[model samples]
Target chain A: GPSGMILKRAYDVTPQKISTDKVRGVRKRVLIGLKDAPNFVMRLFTVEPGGLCDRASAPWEHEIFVLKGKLTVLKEQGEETVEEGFYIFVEPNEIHGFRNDTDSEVEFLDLIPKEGGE
Target chain B: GMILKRAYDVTPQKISTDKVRGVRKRVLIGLKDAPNFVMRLFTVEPGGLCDRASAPWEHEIFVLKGKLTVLKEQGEETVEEGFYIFVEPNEIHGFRNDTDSEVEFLDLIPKEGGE
Candidate 1:
């Protein structure tokens, strides 16, 4: 596949909603996943108040950029509160999760390597 | 190297003014040689434009604020806040801040991967 440019708004992309007791008010959108993108896949996640995403060690690294609101990242080291314009880099298989305990919604851009690279 | 975290504000990061007029860039990551990729924040003032940066690698960009016009093969397209863009390798594309205010965007370049 040949390389090209694709542009779109964050809110315009359809989101995959996830709701539960521990995981509430969550929306994940796959912003760019083209066949030509041989390096990474970009996704957008938004967590409303009281929402959380807990995950076990996986074979992927998460390079995140905080887009809006505050995010509470729970990792093995400890908990860190990240605000807008912050960058969080989680190594491969690092135990980590995210939560938004504030009143406002938290949005961030999550980037991961292409399937096999991690 | 162990995975570490560091936060930074775009304005405070040192600007590389010699690259282009009215265009400033902040290298948020990669100064320490972080493996995988490099992240940067680029700002363009009103009436500012960037020097055409074409390479063998692609660029993944997100519009943090303001409006910017992207020069493409078809023509120019105006992109506003919250817009996400992916530029292919050797696309010969550049950005312009044609509006009255400054335009800022975040871009990521793969270090170990991508064509």
Candidate 2:
């Protein structure tokens, strides 16, 4: 019941491979298209096996989905584990991190939207 | 060509409706539901119609095949094959088939990750 949005066609805004030294694995990302994104942002993320990413956050809220491979969510509360086809919602200001814990890297999607009463 | 990660159809994700609207007009590619983002597909049949719909979030798209028209509240533009488009959230925009063939595209959407 917390989800709110409209309907429209599908497309990919940007599909590219990001090479970063901050993480120890290969990561590819795709910016999914939507009808509007004033308050929300969505993307596809692919991480090679055993890859780690730098901890970063924007002012907006965020969520993550494990599409393939195993992933470990590094949070202040402790570490949480998720296998393929897993979805996790993160509240604002909840320090979080992620890692690929399987033989292959992890593939997931990242969505972020503004936090407020719309 | 880029290598595919793998096909793990454990279960299909319920992506945003924005991605599905295109599917209604035959512009859908596919969606991989995740906790954070919603993957979208855009494969339009020749002379297919573009659904006029909008979501809480805006959309960014890249044309993969043929050409398309951006039917907006203000005006319209024909997006050719392999063109990239960015529509700000809340701005009325939809695809229009101007050519004699259909078009294929992709939508990368960010669900209410934190909201």
Candidate 3:
């Protein structure tokens, strides 16, 4: 493959989804899929005000960076507040979740190994 | 290793050499313990360039500020902020700031028995 340019908004992306199941105001954009990002998958997750993602765990690592707003991160131990410019590394099988417990929306980028992540 | 830390909390080191010019990179936070795909930040000054180069490790990137132009084997494209890019290992890839302003982005590379 050639050198690449991963656009944030491309015509081929799917639509944004709102609340469903235990998640709320969630929008997920997979910027780099398994094919191109051979080592990892880069996805952007945005949660609007009053939104929260239920606690979940996976077998792979999650390297997350907060783009904006304060996000209350839910973990097995408890909750911690992370603001913009912060980076979080969640180890394998670690239970974690994201929530925007403020008046503004929360945007973050999560990078996971493509093989074990969506 | 701590789970959370600010990216800009530390000073950035100038990494531009003869092949690469006018760029600075921030430390990969939480890189103390272990993280296979380590994420690093880069900011290129006006007229800077990440000249064509290759290595055994691949590169995964995300644009943070300004428009960045990438020179790839396939072709070239000017991508705006908020995009991600994947350059395979050993790929002859490069980047440039055609615009007058500074350009910032992130590159996540593999580090293990080989960094």
Candidate 4:
């Protein structure tokens, strides 16, 4: 005595800044997906003050959460500075990059795994 | 060349009080062999309230500091200090901190099948 289809949505508000051109001064917000997230896809990245998010590589695997100022993560076992309650976990093709050199404005909280080959 | 194990870690200890009133939890990353997800760090106290997850499992939230009022199902929603929420799958959610300050957050779930 039933069927299927249950996908409600509610984003709350404030977090919309998807910049382009290789994501300079970064500002990408997305708080859920697949209608209501059955897996993972909650993003929110803001990197100003000389921001930059190039040097990419991803199959899927990044569960960062640095929320607020300070970032200098360029992995492959090299640089690392992530401050302010850090919790980074990038692994799945690896080869990351992100820098804000400091002067304020770093914000982070990105989780990806909506079957993106995770 | 071979090397892969240096993600990051910090957010450990304390989570006891019967799950409500002045609630406090910190696991940061439940590495049961580590592979998927499980990060928590909650601190609510100012009138703390929580115990309405209602079970169905589907979590993901972020408010990292004071001011929260989510009772949802289409009723309450105060959320302050940054805000970024998403709680579906049976979603009956519950969280309150009338405001006096002290409500930190950062909860992400989905550690295989998430139940």
Candidate 5:
């Protein structure tokens, strides 16, 4: 059976800074309008230490995968610890928020349903 | 054209669990033993929640077609039809399907160099 190829070597990607009052600190979004692939949204975010983002929601659903630092997920039930290699699922309309407990930048991906959504 | 490599909907598959875990939502094995890349067939029960996990590699995952919530290191993200996520390496992560619906995703695990 034929399979997809792997990318082992790290490529040099220049980080772009995007800061908004909607959230504290600056973050870079790398896949706002990726070509060839639609129906999905992908972006890279970089948060400085001691920085945090509050709970927010969108019309579409979402899934997040961590790449660095620790993230605490706050839900009605309680909080959960998310460490390296962890993948998180955020429910629709869930009052969710995140905080960087460690003294380092928190980076990860934010994937959302296509625009005008499904 | 890249051909976009298409196989019968029901064709034989190659699996490498330990190294890759899942493949395009079709195989869970890795590309190590085989001549390809890593993949995952991750699923969530209706309103079921999957525990968060982390590792030493980056990833690109697709939500085949379902509803899911992805908790980032410092924000809230969602996944629905055609939703794709490009995660960095070595960060805390977790996912949940708190709805009465099921969720499915295929993760492309980034691997090291040549076969």
Candidate 6:
């Protein structure tokens, strides 16, 4: 049998700022990082109203699920507003980003493969 | 990019319960053919019980509602909503609902396989 499992509350992990000129009012929680999970990294991202993250393209894909308010996301077809309970699957090297254009905060779980997280 | 999905858009299918009772699961992301991982939403009805089981892949679960008592080799713990549990590959574990409320969570796993 394998060893080691991570169990923690969402509130327990500290939120760190994703410092970059392209990112605004966004705080990240590295829920499950590379060291903890062999295949993937689970991260929680919260974007304040009026905040946005610049578009990024990577060779690997991203898996995201919205938990809080509606999130404005840019996909291949164009921009779309995703509400809570919505899940977005981003393809490899497909430029994407998110923005909180509403009054409420947007919180979502983001997962990426170890190959990309590295 | 085409298939942006919401939970309400998909119907919940009872998890193969030739197995557990009425524990439904919705493949929120897998339906889109996402190659990264499979994202599933699971809902455990009150009084539901899952026998201790192990898997070949890791499980990353995020609780969205109710309370769930998880039995593990280390010990048993009752976790409420907003809790996340990362189960290592092949870790023996079981789930039980002691309350009248329901238990809902997002189960994320590598495309490889999982619970």
Please report the candidate that would top DockQ against the real structure: 6
Model 2 chain A: worst 10 consecutive residues (lDDT sum): A1-10
Winner by lDDT between candidate 4 and candidate 1: 1
Residue A33 error, candidate 3, Å = 1.5
Q: List, residue by residue over A1-118, the lDDT tens digit for candidate 2.
A: 1222232322333335565655566544435323334545556667776777655444544555455678777766567777754555555555666777778767666666534211
Worst 10 residues of 6 chain B by lDDT: B14-23
Return the interface RMSD of model 6. 1.7
Off by over 4 Å in 1: A19-24, A34-36, A116-118, B1-19, B31-33, B112-115
Candidate 6 Cα errors over 4 Å, as ranges: B16-19
lDDT value, residue A44 of candidate 2: 60
- Model 6, range A66-114, lDDT digits (tens) per residue? 8999999976557988999898888788889889999988999988888
Which of candidates 1 and 4 reaches a greater TM-score? 1
The DockQ of predicted model 2 stands at: 0.06
Q: What is the two-chain DockQ of model 4?
A: 0.07
Ranking by TM-score: 6, 1, 3, 5, 2, 4
Residues forming the 10-long window of minimal summed lDDT in candidate 2 chain B: B1-10
Docking class of 5: incorrect
**lDDT of each structure?**
0.77, 0.52, 0.77, 0.67, 0.51, 0.83
Per-residue lDDT tens digits for candidate 2, residues B2-87, read 11121232232332353333232221112233333444545555555555665555465555567777776666777675455666
Interface RMSD of each: 2.6, 11.2, 3.1, 10.1, 16.7, 1.7
Please tell me which model should have the higher lDDT, number 3 or number 4: 3
lDDT of 1 by residue, B1-115 (tens): 1233434454434344444567777776663544477777788888887656677778889999899899887688899989999998778788888889889898888874322
